[PDB]
């Protein structure tokens, strides 16, 4: 269209047309906006676009046009600056400097065009990275001079210096070579004396608030790197902690500065520097108390109202107090004149802690943890903070979260546990009185009673058994009162759940009083019958947790009890579980499994296991007889559901019983693998009959569930087995016959990835005992699974991940199985490993590089033999170059450390002379030549062809350094990162690699 004119560079640029296309993009809508976007992109991405930048900055009336012009300059400066003739470089420097001064002199432009001035300042800093100070020695003295002439220029120079400090110290690590980072750091360090002189003058001399803000913004950056003496041996602490706290425009930034000042490295043996650390804190708190709000202010109300920058300021206060007090509160604890300042600071944090902001609360809670842990272990400290600690008990108890939010709950539990140890009597009163408030009804609520319940649960284990006993009794008694008080099943259900939750959290009390424990379990069984699904699932979850804590009490015969209670539970299991859903029944059986595993008499456990599995075994036996009577009777989807649930019951019990499950696995094993084959045939038959769509039908998914749960049961047992001889002699051979051929001979979309997962666990635990078994596994799954995953990176994600898990464990435990492969199949193994390298899938990529490293290590073990010599000649350079491809293509940065590690290992083999034979073919290089010399020639050639903009000198220096550093990972990684920076630009300094 008309907007596409600017893309035609044969004609001079219509500056007025550019400004319209830019406005259509920023101010427009629909197809017009989208078309303007593709045109501006293609203009910007034109490699000659930089020639137009001078034109646009002089003549354009649209600040956004000028912004994008500087983006195009920024692109030229960072990537191709050194390719320009010196005349052009000085030219571009002059119209950037000229434009900045021009905009500063015009008060209207300086006020209204902040984006454009900030972009210009950043673009100047990109030039400083290239030229300063070698080709621009007097820049800093010039800049200091220009500052005195104009307030606007002075302020704008503080933004230049801020950005310069950011680029050199804060964000240099990634974007520059180590050598260039050091050069710029050193340059700013030498001239900082003069920079600080200006910054201190401006702050001390004062006037324009914007200037003071911009100056204080720059100081925040300097505080990351400057020596401490600039803060401590000047008047600057008095100015930050007094003057700049009173005025609100400088308050935000000054407080951020003082936070960073607390983190400055300081001698611990200097009494003056200590008084100065105390003084600036005293000053800052004094200014808050008089100029913002007193200690008694309701910061909760203030934050919630959210006027101006109250929220960001209160956040910045929390960061300041916690940063300072975490490092320095010890200074305030000895001198009794400083006692009021210490407790005032802590009382500010108390008020901050009450603010209704999760992220702010987390920040304060981190500090409170630091403190209460200190009062727990540090001697003669706790008596100082007794009034702060009492307030904090209320704060934590009133903000207790549910156990599902682990990070916050565990943080809150740990603080409140510490606080309970420090004063068990105070915590008791607060919780009891809060419970009384619920009973009286003034604070009564579903959230309040629940939140109190979680708090009471959290502190379990901290009190003495005798104190706990009395406290628990009191809480249960009070909670039972609430039930009597509140009619309506909804209200009663809320407190009923809470009551059950509390008894769950106090196992020691249940261990002590058998009668109470017995009453609670029977009620849970009653609760399992309740029609409401919420009650049933609550009841089931409570039973498992109590069981986990008090399992030993169930298995033994209690005083005045006919039998062990586990025996009683199993009698009525049918009746008890009648109304529960499948997965709730599975939890029940898992719980019983936990108890049965406490009985250590082989006879009594095997009997309890047999009694427990009665119902599913009788259901299994009937379906085994009806199934083999006619396999057509397995077409019933109801029969498919009952089978799945029988298998899942076996998985649930096996999960908690591990090795102790073997007798029950014995009962079902041969018929279960028979069922696996029968289900397998139906799935293959159904696929042919209905097509690929069949695998999506409820019927086939039903059958595939049976197969996956069978594999899951076998996987679960073998992962926990003791008797590994029984695994090999009994379990492995029937399993491999049943799963391997079925896997291989199904179409891709009918192959269960759980087969690969199950095989991984088998090879993990007994791989070393079945060398023929591992050979059979490879042959069945290797070639056909690779074919599913080697066309793209996306299709069959589970197979992809489980495939490289299986190759990894085989390569670890049974490497011999790879030596027995035909040459063509071994070549596919190496192709498969390099294929893993190129994945963005983190699970696949990591495994890929690990297998490569473990493979090279396995080959090294074999020593000087034909297969290791043949391996290196065939595959050494494939690994070197494929590793280099993913290091340097910018799309696999997450794999960087393992890439470096693998590349380091390969280079080390050659320089340690562990490779016995020439890697080169004869008549490619002089006969006497070392692998060391041929490696550097191959790598030089490879990198030259891949990165033709690099010089021979750049590539030579890189390889010289890299090869020498093959035993030093941190430095080797440094040299690789230096290479990645240099390939992104032209004219990289070859001396950078001598760092």
């Amino acid at each position: 269209g008309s907007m596409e004119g600017i893309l035609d560079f044969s004609n001079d640029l219509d500056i007025a047309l550019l400004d319209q296309v830019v406005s259509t993009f920023y101010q427009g809508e629909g197809v017009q906006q989208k078309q303007a976007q593709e045109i501006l992109t293609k203009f910007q991405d034109n490699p000659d676009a930089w020639e137009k930048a001078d034109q646009i900055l002089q003549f354009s009336t649209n600040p956004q046009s000028k912004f994008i012009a500087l983006s195009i300059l920024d692109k030229l400066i960072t990537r191709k600056w050194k390719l320009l003739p010196n005349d052009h470089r000085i030219g571009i420097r002059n119209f950037v400097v000229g434009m900045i001064i021009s905009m500063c002199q015009d008060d209207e432009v300086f006020k209204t065009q902040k984006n454009l001035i900030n972009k210009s300042d950043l673009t100047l800093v990109q030039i400083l990275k290239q030229e300063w100070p070698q080709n621009w020695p007097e820049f800093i003295p010039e800049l200091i001079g220009s500052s005195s002439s104009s307030v606007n220029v002075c302020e704008n120079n503080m933004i230049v210096l801020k950005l310069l400090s950011e680029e050199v110290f804060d964000f240099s690590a990634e974007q520059m070579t180590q050598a260039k980072a050091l050069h710029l750091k050193n340059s700013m360090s030498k001239e900082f004396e003069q920079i600080f002189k200006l910054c201190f003058q401006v702050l001390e001399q004062g006037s324009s608030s914007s200037l003071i803000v911009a100056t204080l913004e720059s100081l925040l950056r300097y505080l990351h790197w400057i020596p401490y003496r600039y803060i401590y041996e000047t008047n600057i602490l008095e100015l930050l902690s007094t003057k700049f706290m009173t005025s609100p425009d400088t308050r935000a930034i000054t407080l951020k500065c003082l936070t960073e000042v607390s983190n400055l490295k300081i001698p611990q043996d200097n009494d003056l520097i200590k008084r100065q650390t105390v003084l600036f804190f005293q000053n800052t708190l004094q200014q808050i108390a008089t100029s913002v709000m007193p200690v008694t202010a309701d910061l909760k109300a203030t934050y919630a109202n959210a006027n101006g920058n109250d929220q960001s300021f209160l956040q910045d206060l929390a960061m300041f107090l916690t940063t300072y007090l975490a490092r320095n509160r010890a200074l305030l604890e000895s001198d009794e004149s400083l006692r009021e300042l210490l407790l005032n600071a802590h009382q500010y944090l108390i008020q901050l802690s009450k603010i209704e902001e999760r992220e702010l609360f987390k920040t304060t809670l981190d500090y409170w943890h630091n403190l209460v842990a200190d009062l727990f272990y540090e001697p003669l400290k706790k008596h100082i903070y007794e009034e702060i600690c009492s307030q904090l008990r209320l704060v934590i108890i009133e903000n207790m979260v549910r156990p599902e939010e682990i990070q916050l709950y565990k943080s809150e539990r740990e603080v409140l546990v510490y606080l309970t140890h420090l004063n068990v009597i105070d915590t008791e009163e607060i919780m009891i009185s809060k419970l009384a408030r619920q009973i009286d009804g003034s604070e009564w609520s579903w959230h309040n009673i629940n939140t109190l319940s979680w708090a009471i649960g959290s502190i379990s284990g901290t009190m003495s058994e005798k104190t706990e006993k009395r406290f628990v009794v009191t809480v249960i008694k009070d909670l039972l009162g609430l039930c009597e008080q509140k009619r309506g099943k909804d209200n009663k259900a809320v407190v009923a759940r809470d009551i059950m939750y509390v008894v769950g959290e106090y196992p020691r009390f249940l261990k002590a009083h058998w009668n109470f424990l017995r009453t609670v379990i029977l009620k849970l069984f009653e609760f399992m019958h309740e029609t409401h699904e919420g009650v049933q699932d609550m009841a089931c979850d409570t039973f498992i947790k109590i069981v986990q804590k008090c399992k030993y009490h169930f298995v033994i015969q209690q005083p005045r009890e006919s039998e062990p209670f586990i025996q009683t539970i199993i009698r009525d299991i049918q009746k008890t579980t009648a109304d529960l859903q499948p997965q709730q029944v599975h939890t029940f059986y898992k719980a019983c499994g936990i108890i049965i595993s406490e009985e250590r008499s082989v006879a009594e456990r095997n009997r309890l296991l047999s009694d427990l599995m009665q119902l599913p075994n009788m259901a299994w036996d009937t379906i085994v007889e009806q199934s083999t009577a006619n396999p057509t009777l397995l077409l019933d989807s109801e029969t498919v559901k009952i089978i799945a649930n029988i298998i899942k019951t076996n998985v649930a019990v096996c999960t908690s019983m591990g090795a102790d499950f073997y007798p029950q696995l014995g009962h079902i094993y041969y018929n279960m693998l028979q069922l696996y084959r029968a289900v397998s045939s139906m799935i293959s038959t159904q696929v042919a009959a209905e097509g690929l769509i069949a695998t999506k039908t409820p019927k086939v998914r039903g059958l595939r569930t049976i197969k996956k749960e069978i594999l899951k049961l076998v996987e679960t047992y073998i992962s926990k087995a003791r008797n590994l001889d029984d695994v090999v002699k009994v379990l492995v051979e029937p399993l491999l016959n049943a799963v391997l051929e079925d896997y291989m001979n199904n179409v891709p979309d009918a192959r269960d990835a759980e087969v690969l997962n199950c095989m991984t666990t088998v090879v993990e635990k007994v791989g070393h005992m079945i060398p023929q078994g591992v050979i059979l596994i490879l042959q069945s799954v290797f070639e056909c699974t690779l074919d599913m995953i080697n066309k793209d990176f996306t299709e069959y994600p589970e197979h992809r991940v489980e495939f490289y898990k299986l190759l990894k464990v085989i390569n670890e435990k049974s490497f011999a199985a790879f030596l027995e492969l035909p040459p063509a199949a071994f070549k596919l193994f190496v192709d498969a490993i390099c294929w893993a390298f190129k994945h963005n899938n983190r699970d696949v990529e990591v495994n890929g590089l690990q297998i490569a490293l473990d493979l090279v290590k396995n080959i090294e073990r074999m020593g000087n033999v034909p297969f290791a010599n043949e391996f290196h000649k065939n595959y050494f350079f494939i690994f070197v170059s494929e590793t280099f491809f993913v290091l340097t293509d910018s799309d696999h940065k997450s794999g960087f450390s393992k890439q470096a590690l693998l590349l380091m290992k390969l280079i080390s083999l050659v320089y340690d002379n562990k490779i016995s034979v020439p890697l080169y073919q004869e008549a490619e290089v002089p006969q006497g030549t070392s692998n060391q010399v041929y490696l550097s020639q191959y790598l030089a050639n490879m990198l030259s062809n891949a990165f033709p903009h690099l010089t021979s000198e750049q590539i030579a220096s890189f390889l010289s350094a890299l090869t020498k550093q093959c035993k030093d990972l941190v430095v080797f990684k440094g040299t690789l990162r230096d290479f990645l920076v240099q390939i992104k630009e032209v004219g990289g300094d070859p001396t950078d690699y001598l760092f």
Partner: protein, 123 residues
Amino acid sequence: TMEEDEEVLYKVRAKLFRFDADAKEWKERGTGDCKFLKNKKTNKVRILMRRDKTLKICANHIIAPEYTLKPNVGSDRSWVYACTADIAEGEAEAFTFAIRFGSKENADKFKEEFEKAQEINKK
């Protein structure tokens, strides 16, 4: 909300899909409470479904007697039917919807309530 004129006959938790023709694939339109609302003025019953949290309407149409619930090949707990005019987006449009429920029970109950609403809408 424009729901005060209406009585809630049936409420069930569901996920709604619309079939895209260009690509032969289902696309989620929303997840939340599916409601059968009988207008007290006209006695006409409509499906109204709102997304969780945003509360935006993903389904708004009359339970027309002509509409027929057809099972999905890959789900025993879903129904697929064609809607001639849905105003959830803004202007009345024709959609091929599929609606999936937590259980086969819910889907079977939905089918009975849908047919009850259809008989009401005939009068």
